Design a binder for this molecule. Structure first.
Ligand SMILES: CC(=O)Nc1ccc2c(c1)CCC2
Length: 118
């Protein structure tokens, strides 16, 4: 009975502050764990710039833009896509960032998203 989309405010973390640098050891695990942390309010977002991905652990979980036609209520519609060894699992739009566990790090911003609970 979960709705197809949920509005979330994600803490945006700087890469060098992140204590737990990924969600696990396989594509299926990272997607699962990312979803669980998103549900629990314990998921952060790192914006991708040069140097960021090499400082994080693969497989990566990205949130990517799902629709251009509109962004309801200020929350960009996004979906999850994992990457391992240059191969992506999911096909979507532009990356908003890479998801990581949040364990109390102080964010630099909050990113409002409307997440597809695929
Ligand atoms: C109320 C709600 O939809 N919570 C929620 C938030 C994020 C996620 C879920 C559930 C399941 C998949 C990821």
């Amino acid at each position: 009975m979960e709705k197809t989309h949920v509005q979330l405010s994600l803490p945006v973390l700087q890469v060098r502050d992140v204590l737990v640098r990924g969600f696990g050891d396989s594509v299926e695990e990272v997607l699962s764990e990312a979803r669980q942390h998103l549900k629990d309010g314990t998921c952060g977002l790192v914006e991708v710039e040069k140097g960021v991905l090499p400082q994080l652990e693969q497989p990566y979980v990205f949130i990517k833009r799902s629709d251009a036609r509109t962004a309801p209520h200020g929350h960009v519609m996004v979906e999850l896509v994992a990457e391992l060894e240059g191969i992506q699992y999911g096909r979507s739009g532009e990356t908003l960032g890479v998801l990581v566990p949040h364990v109390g790090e102080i964010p630099v911003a909050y990113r409002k998203v409307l997440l597809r609970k695929n």
